[PDB]
């Protein structure tokens, strides 16, 4: 069932014999952070909160120990889908507060909550259903992750059929055991690549589920002898893993994108919402694609979009509008990848759309043709822009964007840039083996 | 029992505790496609259908994603013959509908349904009992498929007798547990080659069983440590694997082919039906033999037929009439191989045969001699044509065939040719190791 | 249940079927010493005590065997958290007495008891909750300790997720089973590094728990196939393992340090307590860092402090004041490492702190800036002294320290210096492989 109060949470712990409670939160860069709490400490923790080292939320660029207090949220209580012989295990979330009592503005979760409040000021609320894609590789003799494939299936194929089939089934059952309400799971285009579609639900709950989904799948694969990876592009020559984000806005319990009186069955607000996204998508591209590997996926010749356009029938467009209408009307953004931070990505995605609605930004004419087949002169004539080519270019765009700074806050903005800046500098000075193969003998 | 209504399907799921439902459909090229659905979603799925990416139907030549709705068919519900510890697993089939509500004409299942409807206009219904042949190889240390033999048995031999014998028995029991009602199963001519025969049934039901049969057998072999292969010719110097198709036309509940008054006990319609098949078999040979490897099997010196002829006693003929009469009267076509798409293959066989009946096509005199033992002058004198030698030749014949395009529809016709054309072009530019062993030292 | 009397201890042994009783005590250098006693001998042991070779408390510098008598303390009875098929196992502590009946002054436990008694003269009592950090490596094929990492996680990371995850959970449950009342356990900065926090309690009980904690964790890791190491710096280029000590003084049941009137909410006594610690921390640094490897951790550029300073907001200082106030007011000293002797380390902390209170030593102005970023002239101008660079320097300081000698007693003082002196002399004459790599080719 659903737990609401701390009394209900305590009753469930005693009833089902939960021995350990694990907090859950993410840092600025999207890594999942957690620590364990004995079951007996839970009652005291609900009363006064737990002190911890809040400097862990500032990424790996932390310098000084700082103390903030975490106040648990009973509504987020859930039980992990594995049963150790010792006892049951459960997880819980909460809010971060400074010692003086003010909420800590560096928390990515707090960033999303502020965005929700801004949307609520205009009466709107967002529902997001993401589609997460991941790989399933083998493990070496020492248990370290590898890139060995498990099958050579294709799109929607009925694979695998060996022992790896049971591992895939176990992941589906474990997610359903927690009430995830999976829509559909299927094979993806690349070999040993799978996709899972989440139920179309509230944005705040979805973001927490996405974080929970990541380490649940990874834990299951280890105990079955496999490894699940979320790299945006682990192999060259095959499709990468992306996280498309279907979204919709609801006012007064009704979808606002649907308009029965328009030829495209789309409301005027939906046009503005797309217009806002297109205008600002270049600026916060770093948030949606936070690692260097993310831009190996964003290359022409695959399903990944590298051009800024919106369409109804075309699929290569950055923003795709599914043919579904009515209450199910939705807008799909195809840029993000699973390595992104769901809290930051959704918050910017919401904030960008609202700014377009507020300012009535015209999205322009849709692109129903194949952009990849057009020439540069055609693209220049049509005024079609392109996403940043590499991480360094994305940082330069995001670094002068005042809209991103205003939305994310000063603290998160500065910390995110410095962490990415140091990461890029380390990468740019490495001599890759590809250079040796091409240049050692020629020169 | 047999489930006919969605209420019965739901009751069976609750009764037998089925946790996952898998859809089932095939693309244009014959690959089996599927995706999973949680048991809770089943009730909603029956009411409204499931939206999915239908670009997977168009093969691996897909370019743009297109959305259309699948409506489940409760009459096709069945439970897979393996019991995971989590719960039971079941599969289901359905029809593909475009968003506007019109059925999708690119579905291979829809192609067969149109052919059945065309026969219904003339008052005929067809029953098909196919003979499927496959190999049983060993797996390497990494679980990848190999071509290692399991026994050196011969035709109808009592082999294997080692632990592989239990694996073969499990396949037979699992198929019977699903209600396929197998007729017989025996060893084949080549080592480690086995054959399974099906009972007569409605052509639509038989086609679905053939698709289900393929991945059921493959799954069982993996879990026992072996591999089942359906290549038309996996080894050189031994017989290949083919899928003969015994077929009969039923009108008013009685067999059309049977005729007690004729000396051969075959009706005039059966003569026309054979004549129609012989006239057009050359055109759609690519459908019955879709892959390149299929033509390594159609070479003289084995049971595979390579000349267009029909006979009552000879076995080398392309079309053979078994000695059985009465309701068991049937016509066997020996060209197809298990790699073919059963929906497309049967639809063309039915449509081609009906055209002969309408046009009173005379099949000509049967060939009761050994065609292989004859000379080219004799074959030229007798006017005996031959099947296409390679995949490229078959495509050229199919491409200009007006009848084939009309039967398969424009969408399937164009897509099928392009996929095969690209496949052949890749193959023709490879340097095989056989050339090196022959020409490196010589030249 | 809390065992108090020998009758209660005997009743518990019979009830829970404990077959073996293990004594527990430590030598001067911090090694854990123990010997087994049959359950039947327990009743006789309580009446008269156990005679044993008392030369084991002097370390590895023992020369002549001497006899002292151990008088068991029933209040320290505990049952170890593993269940052999033979029967339960329990541990117990006690005091060491010379044959003439006088207590042995060489016992590290007796040193702490004298320190507690000295504080009792002024009505003060201490509560200490330490934070112990340790590594978790893999065993080789022969079961010998090695240094292969089990995960590449970071600070507060939700790692490991493979089988090592269960091993970590077992440690947490086993500790809770004995009644340790753990606050929180989490991953640390270095890969495969973990931290466990204790609750506040009387310093005598806490010291015994720390000794018990060390071999309990080590035993669990072996039986699961891993190894837990307490080396202050097992790897180069990563953070070391330290044991921070949070301490507080209580008078009349109230916290002495807390003072609501002061702007910093710290009493005048707390300032003197810090002042005493800073004055004498240089002298007994060898006790807190007893092994040679401890000074590899004490290098600039990591979390380890190397400068004598105290701060409230800056956290790189040697002494840190957490933001908590009220009864939770505490002072954290960050120099010690897990290799230190808890009895000697805590005893010297009390003696140094009280001496500051008696003499009203002013702690000086806090350092709120980054000391590592300052220049040598700046630190010289600020008068920021430094901890000893290596074990030899620390011994020289500790050896002329009048305060340390009278605090630890003559017997412990002389024995500790000789043991460390011999250890350093052996190390200073070794030719390390690093020297060969740098100097063989160059010279
Ligand atoms: Mg996808
Ligand atoms: Mg046969
Ligand atoms: Mg720490």
C43 CB-near residues (< 8 Å, 6+ apart): C10
Q: Do C193 and C187 meet the contact criterion of CB atoms below 8 Å apart? A: yes
Q: Degrees (nearest 5) of the Cα angle C433, C438, C439? A: 95
B393 in active site: no
Helix or strand holding residue C45 (H, E): helix C41-48
Q: Using CA atoms, how far apart are residues A274 and A289, in angstroms rounded to an integer?
A: 20
Q: Do A77 and A3 meet the contact criterion of CB atoms below 8 Å apart? A: yes
Judged on CB neighbours under 10 Å (0-12, 13-18, 19+), C295 is buried
Q: Give the 3-state secondary structure of residue B439.
A: helix
Choosing from A332, A337, A355, A423, which is the catalytic residue?
A332
Beta bridge partners of A94: A72
- Phi and psi of C225, rounded to 5°? 95, 5
Q: Determined by which method?
A: cryo-EM
Residue A211 CA to ligand 1 center (angstroms) comes to 19
Closest to B303 in 3D by CA, of B197, B188, B212, B413:
B188
Q: Give the 3-state secondary structure of residue B26.
A: strand
Q: Do C321 and A67 meet the contact criterion of CB atoms below 8 Å apart? A: no
Neighbours of ion ligand 1 (CB under 5 A): A 195
Choosing from C151, C188, C283, C337, which is the catalytic residue?
C188
Q: Using CA atoms, how far apart are residues C230 and C232, in angstroms rounded to an integer?
A: 6
Q: Chain A interface, mutation test: which of B30, B31, B72, B81, most A Cβ atoms within 10 Å? A: B31
Long-range pairs of A237-240 with CB within 8 A, sequence gap ≥ 24: A238/A189, A238/A190, A238/A191, A238/A193, A239/A188, A239/A189, A239/A190, A239/A193, A239/A302, A239/A303, A239/A304, A240/A190, A240/A296, A240/A297, A240/A302, A240/A304, A240/A337
A170: which chain B residues are within 8 Å (Cβ-Cβ)? 86
CA A122 to chain centre: 25
Closest to A135 in 3D by CA, of A28, A268, A211, A227:
A227
Q: Using CA atoms, how far apart are residues C75 and C95, in angstroms rounded to an integer?
A: 12
Q: Is A323's CB within 8 Å of B62's CB?
A: no
Choosing from B188, B208, B259, B355, which is the catalytic residue?
B188
B195 in active site: yes
Is position C118 annotated in a ligand binding site?
no
The CA distances from residue A193 to A190, B21, B33, B223, B233, in Å, are 5, 20, 15, 21, 30
C334 CB-near residues (< 8 Å, 6+ apart): C242, C244, C303, C304, C305, C317, C318, C319, C320
Half-sphere exposure in the Cβ direction for B93 (13 Å, CA) = 19
Choosing from C27, C95, C133, C337, which is the catalytic residue?
C133
Pairing of strands B50-53, B36-38: unpaired
Closest CA in chain C for residue A226: C162
Q: Do C95 and C70 meet the contact criterion of CB atoms below 8 Å apart? A: yes
Closest to A190 in 3D by CA, of A290, A288, A303:
A303
Q: Using CA atoms, how far apart are residues C396 and A111, in angstroms rounded to an integer?
A: 55
- Phi and psi of C128, rounded to 5°? -130, 130
> Where do runs of H (alpha helix) occur along B122-267?
164-177, 203-224
Eight-state DSSP code of residue B102: P
Dihedral class, residue A252 (left if φ above 0, else alpha if ψ from -120 to 50, else beta): left
A177 interfaces chain B, CB cutoff of 8 Å: no
Q: Using CA atoms, how far apart are residues B399 and B416, in angstroms rounded to an integer?
A: 10
Of C157, C316, C320, the CB nearest to A33: C157
**Dihedral of the CA atoms C251, C253, C256, C262 (nearest 10)?**
-140
Rg of the Cα trace of chain A? 23
Q: Do C289 and C232 meet the contact criterion of CB atoms below 8 Å apart? A: yes
Eight-state DSSP code of residue B295: G
Q: How many CB pairs under 8 A join A and B?
A: 82
Sign (positive or negative) of CA dihedral C169, C170, C173, C179: negative
Dihedral class, residue A143 (left if φ above 0, else alpha if ψ from -120 to 50, else beta): left
Is position A15 annotated in a ligand binding site?
no
Beta bridge partners of C331: C247
Residue C376 CA to ligand 2 center (angstroms) comes to 92
Beta bridge partners of B258: B266
Q: Do C160 and C150 meet the contact criterion of CB atoms below 8 Å apart? A: yes
B229: which chain A residues are within 8 Å (Cβ-Cβ)? none
- Phi and psi of C81, rounded to 5°? -85, 50
Half-sphere exposure in the Cβ direction for C95 (13 Å, CA) = 18
Helix or strand holding residue B129 (H, E): strand B125-138
Q: Is A223's CB within 8 Å of C162's CB?
A: yes
SS (H, E, C) chain A: CCCCCHHHHHHHHHHHCEEEEEECEECCCCCEECCEEECCHHHHHHHHCEEEEHHHHHHHHCCCCCEEEEEEEEEEEEECCCCCCCCEEEEEEEEEECCCCCECCCCHHHHHHHHHHHHHHCCCEEEEEEEEEEEEEEECCCCCECCCCCCCCCCCECCCCCCHHHHHHHHHHHHHHCCCCCCEEEECCCCCEEEEECCCEEHHHHHHHHHHHHHHHHHHHHHHCEEEECCCCCCCCCCCCCEEEEEEEEECCEECCECCCCCCCECHHHHHHHHHHHHHCCCCHHHHCCCCCHHHHCCCCCCCCCECCEECCCCCCCEECCCCCHHHCCEEECCCCCCCCHHHHHHHHHHHHHHHHHHCCCCCCCCCCCCCCCCHHHHHHHCCCECCCCHHHHHHHHHHCHHHHHHHCHHHHHHHHHHHHHHHHHHHCCCCHHHHHHHCCCC
Rg of the Cα trace of chain B? 23
SS (H, E, C) C105-169: CCCHHHHHHHHHHHHHHCCCEEEEEEEEEEEEEEECCCCCECCCCCCCCCCCECCCCCCHHHHHH
Of C161, C182, C320, the CB nearest to A219: C161
B302 CB-near residues (< 8 Å, 6+ apart): B239, B240
Residue B209 CA to ligand 2 center (angstroms) comes to 19
Q: Using CA atoms, how far apart are residues A285 and A304, in angstroms rounded to an integer?
A: 14
Is position A195 annotated in a ligand binding site?
yes
B20: which chain A residues are within 8 Å (Cβ-Cβ)? 169, 172-173
Pairing of strands B331-333, A88-97: unpaired
Neighbours of ion ligand 2 (CB under 5 A): B 195
Q: Is C169's CB within 8 Å of A143's CB?
A: no
Q: Give the 3-state secondary structure of residue C50.
A: strand
Q: How far A126 CA sits from the closest chain B CA (Å)?
A: 22
Q: Is A51's CB within 8 Å of C185's CB?
A: no
Residue A244 CA to ligand 1 center (angstroms) comes to 8
Closest to A23 in 3D by CA, of A212, A203, A220:
A212
Q: Using CA atoms, how far apart are residues C284 and C281, in angstroms rounded to an integer?
A: 6
B352 CB-near residues (< 8 Å, 6+ apart): B276, B277, B279, B280, B281, B284, B403, B407
Q: Minimum-distance ligand to the CA of B184?
A: 2
Q: Using CA atoms, how far apart are residues B150 and B162, in angstroms rounded to an integer?
A: 9
Closest to A255 in 3D by CA, of A267, A264, A245:
A267
A385 CB-near residues (< 8 Å, 6+ apart): A282, A307, A308
Q: Using CA atoms, how far apart are residues C151 and C168, in angstroms rounded to an integer?
A: 12
Q: How many CB pairs under 8 A join A and C?
A: 78
> Where do runs of H (alpha helix) occur along C373-431?
376-382, 391-400, 402-408, 410-427
Choosing from A194, A334, A351, A415, which is the catalytic residue?
A334
Q: Using CA atoms, how far apart are residues A291 and A289, in angstroms rounded to an integer?
A: 6
Q: How far A328 CA sits from the closest chain B CA (Å)?
A: 11
Q: Using CA atoms, how far apart are residues C42 and C9, in angstroms rounded to an integer?
A: 10
Q: Give the 3-state secondary structure of residue B287.
A: helix
Eight-state DSSP code of residue B118: H
> Where do runs of H (alpha helix) occur along B17-144?
42-48, 108-121
Q: Using CA atoms, how far apart are residues A106 and C384, in angstroms rounded to an integer?
A: 33
Pairing of strands C88-97, C18-23: parallel
Of C154, C165, C169, the CB nearest to A60: C154
Q: Do C103 and C235 meet the contact criterion of CB atoms below 8 Å apart? A: no
Q: Each residue of A50-84: b (16+ CB within 10 Å) or e?
A: bbbbbbbbbbebbeebbebbbebebebbbbbbeee
A61 interfaces chain C, CB cutoff of 8 Å: no
Half-sphere exposure in the Cβ direction for A365 (13 Å, CA) = 6
Q: Chain A interface, mutation test: which of C156, C159, C193, C320, most A Cβ atoms within 10 Å? A: C156
Reported resolution, Å: 3.0
B131 in active site: yes
Eight-state DSSP code of residue C441: T
Q: Using CA atoms, how far apart are residues C336 and C345, in angstroms rounded to an integer?
A: 8
Q: Do A189 and A7 meet the contact criterion of CB atoms below 8 Å apart? A: no
């Amino acid at each position: 069932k659903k737990c609401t109060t701390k009394e209900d949470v305590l009753e469930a712990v005693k009833e089902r014999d939960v021995k350990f409670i694990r907090t859950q939160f993410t840092d600025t860069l999207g890594i999942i952070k957690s620590w364990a709490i004995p079951a007996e400490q839970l009652e005291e923790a609900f009363e006064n909160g737990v002190m911890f080292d809040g400097s862990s939320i500032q990424g790996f660029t932390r310098i000084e120990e700082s103390d903030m207090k975490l106040a648990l949220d009973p509504s987020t209580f859930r039980i992990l889908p594995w049963r150790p012989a010792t006892g049951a295990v459960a997880r819980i979330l909460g809010d971060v507060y400074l010692p003086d009592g003010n909420p800590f503005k560096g928390d990515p979760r707090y960033v999303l909550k502020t965005a929700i409040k801004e949307a609520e000021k205009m009466g709107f609320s967002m529902n997001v259903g993401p589609e997460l894609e991941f790989f399933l590789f083998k493990l070496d003799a020492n248990g370290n992750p590898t890139t060995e494939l498990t099958d050579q299936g294709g799109y929607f194929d009925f694979a695998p059929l060996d022992r790896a089939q049971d591992v895939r089934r176990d992941i589906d059952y474990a997610l359903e055991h927690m009430g995830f309400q999976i829509e559909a799971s299927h094979h993806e285009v690349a070999p040993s690549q799978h996709e899972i579609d989440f139920r179309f639900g509230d944005v705040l709950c979805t973001a927490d589920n996405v974080v929970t989904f990541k380490y649940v799948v990874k834990s299951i694969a280890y105990h079955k002898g496999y490894y699940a990876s979320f790299m945006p592009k682990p192999l060259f020559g095959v499709n990468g893993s992306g996280m498309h984000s279907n979204q919709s806005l609801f006012k007064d319990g009704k979808n606002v994108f649907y308009d029965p009186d328009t030829p495209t069955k789309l409301s005027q607000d939906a046009m503005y919402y797309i217009g806002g996204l297109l205008k600002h998508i270049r600026e916060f591209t770093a948030v949606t694609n936070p690692v260097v590997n993310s831009y190996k996926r964003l290359v022409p010749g695959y399903e990944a979009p590298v051009y800024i356009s919106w369409s109804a029938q075309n699929r290569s467009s950055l923003i795709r509008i599914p043919a579904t209408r009515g209450n199910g009307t939705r807008i799909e953004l195809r840029c993000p990848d699973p390595a992104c931070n769901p809290y930051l990505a959704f918050a910017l995605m919401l904030r960008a759309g609202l700014e377009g609605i507020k300012n009535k930004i015209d999205p322009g004419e849709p692109t129903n043709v194949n952009i990849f087949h057009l020439s540069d002169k055609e693209r220049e004539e049509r005024g079609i822009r392109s996403l940043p080519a590499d991480l360094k270019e994305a940082i330069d765009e995001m670094k002068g964007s005042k809209f991103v700074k205003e939305a994310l806050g000063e603290h998160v903005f500065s910390h995110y840039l410095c962490a990415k800046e140091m990461e890029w500098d380390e990468y740019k000075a490495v001599v890759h083996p590809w250079e040796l193969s091409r240049y050692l003998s020629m020169l």
